[PDB]
Scaffold this motif. Structure first.
Motif, mmCIF file in Angstrom:
data_model
loop_
_atom_site.group_PDB
_atom_site.id
_atom_site.type_symbol
_atom_site.label_atom_id
_atom_site.label_comp_id
_atom_site.label_asym_id
_atom_site.label_seq_id
_atom_site.Cartn_x
_atom_site.Cartn_y
_atom_site.Cartn_z
ATOM 1 N N UNK E 217 0.833 -1.209 0.000
ATOM 2 C CA UNK E 217 0.000 0.000 0.000
ATOM 3 C C UNK E 217 0.862 1.252 0.000
ATOM 4 N N UNK E 218 0.400 2.271 -0.713
ATOM 5 C CA UNK E 218 1.183 3.480 -0.932
ATOM 6 C C UNK E 218 0.671 4.580 -0.011
ATOM 7 N N UNK E 219 1.530 5.032 0.899
ATOM 8 C CA UNK E 219 1.249 6.202 1.731
ATOM 9 C C UNK E 219 1.803 7.472 1.093
ATOM 10 N N UNK E 220 1.449 7.682 -0.178
ATOM 11 C CA UNK E 220 1.995 8.802 -0.939
ATOM 12 C C UNK E 220 1.623 10.142 -0.322
ATOM 13 N N UNK E 221 0.471 10.214 0.347
ATOM 14 C CA UNK E 221 -0.087 11.493 0.771
ATOM 15 C C UNK E 221 0.830 12.251 1.721
ATOM 16 N N UNK E 222 1.788 11.572 2.345
ATOM 17 C CA UNK E 222 2.808 12.246 3.138
ATOM 18 C C UNK E 222 4.165 12.058 2.473
ATOM 19 N N UNK E 223 4.315 10.968 1.716
ATOM 20 C CA UNK E 223 5.618 10.642 1.144
ATOM 21 C C UNK E 223 6.049 11.709 0.146
ATOM 22 N N UNK E 224 5.187 12.029 -0.823
ATOM 23 C CA UNK E 224 5.574 13.065 -1.773
ATOM 24 C C UNK E 224 5.554 14.448 -1.135
ATOM 25 N N UNK E 225 4.621 14.704 -0.215
ATOM 26 C CA UNK E 225 4.590 15.991 0.467
ATOM 27 C C UNK E 225 5.866 16.262 1.251
ATOM 28 N N UNK E 226 6.564 15.217 1.695
ATOM 29 C CA UNK E 226 7.804 15.397 2.434
ATOM 30 C C UNK E 226 9.048 15.252 1.571
ATOM 31 N N UNK E 227 8.973 14.521 0.456
ATOM 32 C CA UNK E 227 10.150 14.266 -0.361
ATOM 33 C C UNK E 227 10.267 15.159 -1.588
ATOM 34 N N UNK E 228 9.167 15.750 -2.064
ATOM 35 C CA UNK E 228 9.249 16.650 -3.208
ATOM 36 C C UNK E 228 10.098 17.868 -2.880
ATOM 37 N N UNK E 229 9.859 18.482 -1.719
ATOM 38 C CA UNK E 229 10.666 19.625 -1.300
ATOM 39 C C UNK E 229 12.115 19.207 -1.109
ATOM 40 N N UNK E 230 12.336 18.052 -0.479
ATOM 41 C CA UNK E 230 13.687 17.523 -0.329
ATOM 42 C C UNK E 230 14.401 17.457 -1.673
ATOM 43 N N UNK E 231 13.715 16.945 -2.693
ATOM 44 C CA UNK E 231 14.341 16.799 -4.001
ATOM 45 C C UNK E 231 14.544 18.143 -4.692
ATOM 46 N N UNK E 232 13.583 19.061 -4.576
ATOM 47 C CA UNK E 232 13.654 20.304 -5.336
ATOM 48 C C UNK E 232 14.471 21.387 -4.651
ATOM 49 N N UNK E 233 14.850 21.198 -3.384
ATOM 50 C CA UNK E 233 15.627 22.227 -2.707
ATOM 51 C C UNK E 233 16.943 22.428 -3.447
ATOM 52 N N UNK E 234 17.227 23.645 -3.905
ATOM 53 C CA UNK E 234 18.356 23.877 -4.831
ATOM 54 C C UNK E 234 19.725 23.930 -4.157
ATOM 55 N N UNK E 235 20.208 22.758 -3.744
ATOM 56 C CA UNK E 235 21.576 22.611 -3.265
ATOM 57 C C UNK E 235 22.519 22.175 -4.379
ATOM 58 N N UNK E 236 22.066 22.258 -5.629
ATOM 59 C CA UNK E 236 22.875 21.865 -6.776
ATOM 60 C C UNK E 236 23.408 23.052 -7.560
ATOM 61 N N UNK E 237 22.928 24.266 -7.298
ATOM 62 C CA UNK E 237 23.443 25.439 -7.994
ATOM 63 C C UNK E 237 24.843 25.767 -7.494
ATOM 64 N N UNK E 238 25.780 25.912 -8.425
ATOM 65 C CA UNK E 238 27.176 26.148 -8.092
ATOM 66 C C UNK E 238 27.585 27.603 -8.258
ATOM 67 N N UNK E 239 26.706 28.451 -8.795
ATOM 68 C CA UNK E 239 27.050 29.860 -8.911
ATOM 69 C C UNK E 239 27.174 30.539 -7.555
ATOM 70 N N UNK E 240 26.645 29.946 -6.483
ATOM 71 C CA UNK E 240 26.929 30.507 -5.167
ATOM 72 C C UNK E 240 28.359 30.181 -4.751
ATOM 73 N N UNK E 241 28.872 29.014 -5.160
ATOM 74 C CA UNK E 241 30.312 28.792 -5.050
ATOM 75 C C UNK E 241 31.094 29.741 -5.947
ATOM 76 N N UNK E 242 30.533 30.130 -7.093
ATOM 77 C CA UNK E 242 31.203 31.132 -7.919
ATOM 78 C C UNK E 242 31.292 32.460 -7.176
#
Ligand SMILES: Nc1ncnc2c1ncn2[C@@H]1O[C@H](COP(=O)(O)OP(=O)(O)O)[C@@H](O)[C@H]1O
Lengths: 132, 195, 373, 100, 256, 48, 191
Positions: E217-242
């Motif tokens: 059974x899929x408990x998506x109703x909290x799974x995506x609500x908690x993991x979408x932000x985790x995935x989309x949080x922009x810790x991959x932009x390197x211009x701040x290192x620039x």
């Protein structure tokens, strides 16, 4: 009248009960009895220990209530694991590894009751960082 | 109805909790039977974010027992000589204070036995002051229900030997209440504020 | 009571057997099984035309036995109370039922719900708002009774057609759909309910996620046979698909409650057509230029400002908004359904992160053998 | 009807329950209190100098919930009786107590 | 209703020993007792434990017994010796939770309104978890979802009991689980941090794979609500290192 | 140490000023009846 | 002396609050409980009677104790609104009376049934076989209206008292009124 290089297998939870009880009653010199059994003469093992509130009278044999002790022992027998009484423990902030006169008297009473009834000094305040 | 089960719980709860009160009161009362530190109440009314106390121990120390953990600030006012826990550093119970060295018993007679019959001559005045003083003592409830508060200040003026002292002690005996004598002429003490 | 039993054995075929059962039940002093028999007789395939007479008989029996099950008695007699159909005395009937059973069980709260339903049916100003709010105010310490919860959900879903509650009305309709799972009522009427909930989501403003109804099978399968354009439009709102032609066909497919708010539909779909980029690209494409926005939302240049303003206000994108290059930074704090059939994308990104982390751990282990070996 | 004395029994139970809650607060506290001292020196953000009113001054820590702005120098405070750390700060008063 | 719970390093070993001593004759694998402690500032802590023998049957998970009189006498004695200690929850071993937990909670919540469940892994030491906390929430599974039990995990962190440091140091006195030998100790810190990160994120990837397969059974109703932000949080932009090319590289070169 | 006594209650308790400045009250030792001890007399006290 | 340790599991079904007996069948069963506990106390005041419930729960708070007032207080306002779980109830009564007690104390489980029950014949026969293998001693008394001494109850009692067992009877009570003295007459001294 035989007392070799005897060793006490004390338990970590007995230690934790000792430290909690002392930290609670730091200035009251709280009393208790070390629940151990003489599996033989000198290899004494203590697995559990309890905390008892010292009565207003102070260090007295009646402060350790007999009916309360019996009920506690029955509760331990029903839930948990039964264990004999052949020792006692006491937070001793006043001075160190010896016993006061009243402590000696009540330990004499405990020796008359039990076979050894070891006298255990545990200083709660001197144990601070490394040395209990 | 529910009363049977209700009273079955009520008697048990009342008796068991009064037994618990007895247990706590004994464990505190042997400590109340061993109080050691004077109670110089530097009263701070710390209301819990109700009251509190600062106790100056006899051994020259300060104990801040929280919220006065055994007695009530109504009967415990900032003062001294109220039982303090020797081990628990807590206000234990009230006890009589100290009556200022001299006034502990300056000349206080516990009970005078001189009788009104052995004095006389001024019987009208003595009966007047009896009505003004002793009657407010025995029949105090009489004045209470009447609504008139009896006066207190009575001044016997007259040359010595006129029996003011005997009359006063006899009046106190008739009242059967406490009598305190003040030696006025020696109230002039050099010490500042001593009188 | 024997006389009333003798009279009541008439007025229905097959009734005298149940009346004999009732006689036995009060002879042996049974109340719960009597309530079950009353339930069976009321839900018997009949209209209960003698509503007043059966009300009188039931009140007679319950007043001379005075030990029936309260909540179920009220649950059953509420049918007769509603069927009597006279609001001026229906309020007094509900007061009488409250006085006969004033316990804090389901009975009183069901009486409150009946009062609210009557106030909807006539006099929608007297105590409607207080009644509807007080149902939830009194559902305290009642987490999973679910019966009067379903009742309250039904009342507020019907209150959707009132100014007070639109989005909350849709929410409690969803709560009803959850609490009661089986169909237990015609599929056509469930499809009408789904139509109403879809229109509620379309007309509403705060329903950007509006979860548990976008791709919900329990709601979509009702209209799987009719008005599948509604299913497609809800899927568009869910996944960010624009399908502007199909969405305009949606706007004028169910003309009531949609023609006036087709503009709000435009704004909401323009708002929700960016979330697809937002979750699909974890800052992989963090340059939301004007041309990209035009591709995503088929919107003009001046409306971009208002659209991104409302996006920041709701919580879609919270990043910086430039205009020299028209770049919009990508942060989302209002997640929604990610099309669990398309969970492969996020699984692949997560396994990419796993591979990168493990590869760098092994690389630093290779560089660190001189201490760790 | 014994059930009509339910009111008197309720009054008795409330009366004894007031005493019971009083005794519960009296025994549940069973506290040793805190010793009273003055902020002799703040020293630093972590360690502070607190002098008891009757001699010894100690280098102690501060209460977690309190802050230096609430502690301040030269203000009455309470140290833990055993562990010797700041527990609460208290206001003080002086009284001439004569001819007032 | 509590915000979070914090477990002391004071009751875990006591529970484990109670399991060991009462499993000599009771091989039900199900040790059930009560954890006593205190809840003061939306932080719940456990200071004492107690075990009761307990037998289960798989038939609807409604076969059991306890010694409630003895347990209540224990609680009274514990409160008498220490008034601040109170029953904060009840604990059951066997992390594979069965269905009698609801009945046990209903019976024991008369001691604690916010009844909580505690699972102790006596034998398992999976990565570092000694125990897990459970809060009972049956107030509707979700906005548009059917009824369920839904026992959620209130966040738990191992506390720092006082005066136990001396005892634990004397007990171990072999591993020295401190920052001693700073460089090598921090190397080990990085090592097991990477180990835990990889293991947990692999578990999350496995959960996503199994949701994709749909066998569970899929408990998506909290799974995506908690993991979408985790995935989309922009810790991959390197211009701040620039922008921060000398993020600390100046400090690196001054340290060189 | 031995200190004088101050006074007492009706019978059992004894409120005493003690040379350690102490507000000292004790249960008089069982071997000592309250009759013998009088206010303002010096008694030794067992430190325990 | 032969002392008896008795565990009574009492039917707290939704029907028990009906007034088939003068107060309520629930109160009639409570009276059966306190009279049998009085008989045990008169035999010896330290005879112990404990409570078990089966209304989707198992009440153990009133343990195997001589005092009856706790049984009365805790069984009063039991809220008889739930269902009946016989298979769980007698089994958990067995576990509860399996707890720490004297070996001289004769173990006995008594059950009170007052309402119709909807359980599986196969399940109850399996329970009866399991209790036969475990050598359980249970006697059951009915009250008021029910399919009293139904096939399941009769087979359960026959399994628990046969094979040269105690010989504990189950009584087929008339629906509604019943004579508790005649119900408990046999097992109080024989069985
Ligand atoms: N009416 C009286 N009857 C008996 N003795 C008296 C009377 N009046 C005065 N005395 C004597 O006078 C003495 C008291 O003198 P004192 O009290 O100094 O007088 P005054 O009160 O007028 O100053 C007592 O010893 C008492 O014997």
């Amino acid at each position: 009248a035989v007392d070799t290089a005897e060793q006490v297998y004390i338990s970590s939870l007995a230690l934790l009960k000792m430290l909690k009880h002392g930290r609670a009653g730091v200035p009251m010199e709280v009393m208790g009895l070390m629940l151990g059994e003489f599996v033989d003469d000198y290899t004494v093992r203590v697995i559990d220990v309890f905390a008892m509130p010292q009565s207003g009278t102070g260090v007295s044999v009646e402060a350790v209530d007999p009916v309360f002790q019996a009920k506690m022992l029955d509760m331990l027998k029903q839930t948990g694991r039964p264990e004999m009484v052949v020792g006692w423990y006491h937070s001793h902030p006043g001075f160190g590894c010896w016993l006061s006169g009243v402590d000696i008297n009540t330990q004499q009473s405990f020796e008359a009751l039990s076979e050894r009834a070891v006298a255990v000094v545990v200083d709660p305040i001197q144990s601070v960082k490394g040395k209990v | 109805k529910i009363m049977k089960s209700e009273v079955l719980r009520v008697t048990h709860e009342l008796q068991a909790m009064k037994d618990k009160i007895k247990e706590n009161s004994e464990k505190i009362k042997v400590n109340k039977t061993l109080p050691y530190l004077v109670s110089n109440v530097i009263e701070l009314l710390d209301v819990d974010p109700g009251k509190c106390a600062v106790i100056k121990t006899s051994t020259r120390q300060t104990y801040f027992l929280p919220v006065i953990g055994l007695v009530d600030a109504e009967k415990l006012k900032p003062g001294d000589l109220v039982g303090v826990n020797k081990d628990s550093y807590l206000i234990l119970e009230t006890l009589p204070t100290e009556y200022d060295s001299r006034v502990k018993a300056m000349e206080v007679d516990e009970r005078p036995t001189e009788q009104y019959s052995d004095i006389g001559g001024l019987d009208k005045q003595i009966q007047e002051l009896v009505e003004a003083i002793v009657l407010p003592m025995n029949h105090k409830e009489k004045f209470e229900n009447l609504g008139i508060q009896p006066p207190k200040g009575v001044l016997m003026y007259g040359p010595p030997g006129t029996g003011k002292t005997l009359l006063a002690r006899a009046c106190a005996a008739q009242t059967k209440a406490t009598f305190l004598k003040l030696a006025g002429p020696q109230l002039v003490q050099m010490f500042i504020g001593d009188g | 009571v024997p006389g009333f039993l003798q009279q009541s054995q008439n007025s229905g075929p097959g009734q005298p057997a149940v009346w004999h059962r009732l006689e036995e039940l009060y002879t042996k002093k049974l109340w719960h099984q009597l309530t079950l028999q009353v339930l069976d007789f009321v839900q018997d395939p009949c209209f209960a035309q003698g509503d007043g007479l059966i009300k009188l008989y039931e009140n007679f029996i319950s007043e001379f036995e005075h030990r029936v099950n309260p909540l179920s008695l009220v649950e059953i007699i509420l049918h007769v109370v509603r069927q009597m159909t006279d609001p001026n005395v229906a309020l007094t009937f509900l007061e009488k039922t409250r006085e006969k059973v004033k316990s804090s069980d389901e009975a009183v709260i069901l009486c409150k719900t009946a009062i609210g339903a009557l106030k909807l049916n006539i006099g929608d100003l007297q105590v409607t708002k207080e009644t509807i709010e007080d149902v939830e105010e009194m559902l305290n310490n009642l987490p999973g009774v679910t019966s009067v919860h379903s009742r309250f959900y039904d009342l507020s879903s019907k209150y959707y057609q009132t100014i007070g509650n639109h989005a909350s009305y849709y929410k409690d309709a969803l709560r009803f759909l959850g609490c009661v799972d089986i169909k237990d009522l015609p599929v056509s009427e469930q499809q009408e309910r789904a139509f109403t909930l879809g229109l509620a989501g379309l007309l509403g403003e705060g329903v950007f996620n509006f979860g548990e109804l976008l791709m919900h099978p329990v709601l979509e399968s009702l209209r799987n046979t009719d008005r599948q354009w509604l299913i497609d439009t809800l899927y568009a709102f869910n996944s960010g698909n624009v399908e502007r032609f199909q969405t305009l066909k949606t706007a004028w497919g169910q003309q009531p409650d949609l023609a006036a708010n087709e503009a709000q539909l435009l704004r909401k779909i323009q708002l929700l057509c960016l979330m697809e980029m937002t979750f699909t690209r974890p800052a992989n494409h963090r340059q939301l230029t004007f041309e990209e926005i035009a591709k995503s939302a088929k919107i003009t240049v001046n409306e971009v400002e208002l659209l991104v303003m409302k996006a920041l206000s709701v919580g879609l994108v919270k990043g910086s908004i430039d205009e020299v290059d028209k770049r919009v930074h990508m942060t989302w704090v209002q997640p929604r359904v990610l099309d669990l059939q398309q969970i492969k994308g996020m699984k692949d990104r997560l396994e990419f992160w796993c591979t990168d982390v493990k590869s760098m751990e092994m690389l630093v282990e290779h560089q660190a053998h001189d201490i760790l070996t | 009807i014994d059930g009509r004395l339910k009111e008197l029994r309720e009054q008795l139970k409330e009366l004894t329950k007031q005493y019971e809650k009083s005794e519960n607060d009296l025994k549940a506290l069973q506290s040793v209190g805190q010793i009273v001292g003055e902020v002799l020196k703040q020293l630093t953000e972590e360690k502070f100098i607190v002098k008891a009113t009757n001699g010894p001054r100690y280098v102690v820590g501060c209460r977690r919930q309190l802050d230096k702005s609430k502690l301040k120098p030269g203000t009455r405070v309470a140290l833990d009786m055993t562990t010797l750390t700041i527990m609460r700060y208290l206001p003080r008063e002086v009284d001439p107590l004569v001819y007032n | 209703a509590v915000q979070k719970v914090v477990v002391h390093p004071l009751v875990l070993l006591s529970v484990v020993d109670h399991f060991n001593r009462i499993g000599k004759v009771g091989n039900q694998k199900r040790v059930v007792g009560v954890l006593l402690g205190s809840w003061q500032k939306k932080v719940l802590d456990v200071s004492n434990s107690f075990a009761v023998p307990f037998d289960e049957d798989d038939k609807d998970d409604s076969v059991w017994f306890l010694d409630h009189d003895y347990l209540e006498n224990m609680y009274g004695m514990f409160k008498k010796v220490n008034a601040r200690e109170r029953i904060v929850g009840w604990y059951h071993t066997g992390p594979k939770l069965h269905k009698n937990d609801i009945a046990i909670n209903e019976l024991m919540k008369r001691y604690c309104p916010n009844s909580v469940l505690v699972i102790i892994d006596v034998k398992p030491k999976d990565l570092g978890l000694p125990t897990e906390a459970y809060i009972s929430v049956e107030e509707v599974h979700d906005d548009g979802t059917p009824t369920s039990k839904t026992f959620e995990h209130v966040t738990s962190e191992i506390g720092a009991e006082e005066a136990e440091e001396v005892g634990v140091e004397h007990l171990l006195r072999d591993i020295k689980d401190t920052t001693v030998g700073t460089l090598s100790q921090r190397i080990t810190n990085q090592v097991h941090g990477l180990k835990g990160l990889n293991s947990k994120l692999l578990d999350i990837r496995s959960y996503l794979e199994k949701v994709a397969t749909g066998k569970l059974p899929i408990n998506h109703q909290i799974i995506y609500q908690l993991q979408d932000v985790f995935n989309l949080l922009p810790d991959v932009s390197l211009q701040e290192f620039v922008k921060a090319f000398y993020l600390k590289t100046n400090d690196q070169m001054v340290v060189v | 140490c031995t200190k004088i006594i101050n006074a007492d209650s009706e019978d059992p308790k004894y409120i005493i000023n003690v040379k350690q400045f102490a507000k000292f009250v004790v249960d008089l030792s069982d071997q000592v009846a309250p009759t013998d001890i009088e206010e303002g007399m010096r008694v030794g006290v067992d430190r325990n | 002396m032969v002392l008896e340790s008795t565990m009574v599991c009492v039917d707290n079904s939704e029907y028990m609050r009906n007034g088939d007996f003068l107060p309520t069948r629930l109160q009639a069963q409570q009276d059966a409980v306190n009279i049998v506990c009085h008989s045990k106390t008169r035999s010896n005041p330290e005879n112990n009677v404990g409570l078990i419930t089966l209304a989707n729960d198992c009440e153990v708070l009133t343990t195997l104790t001589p005092d009856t007032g706790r049984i009365l207080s805790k069984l009063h306002t039991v809220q008889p609104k739930g269902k009946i779980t016989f298979c769980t109830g007698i089994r958990v009564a067995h576990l509860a009376l399996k707890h720490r007690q004297g070996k001289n104390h004769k173990m006995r489980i008594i059950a009170f049934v007052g309402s119709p029950v909807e359980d599986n014949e196969k399940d109850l026969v399996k329970l009866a076989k399991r209790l036969k293998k475990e050598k359980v001693n249970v006697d059951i008394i009915n009250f008021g209206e029910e399919e009293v001494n139904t096939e399941k109850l009769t087979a359960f009692v026959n399994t628990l008292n046969g094979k040269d067992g105690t010989g504990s009877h189950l009584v087929t009570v008339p629906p509604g009124p019943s004579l508790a003295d005649a119900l408990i007459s046999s097992p109080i001294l024989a069985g």
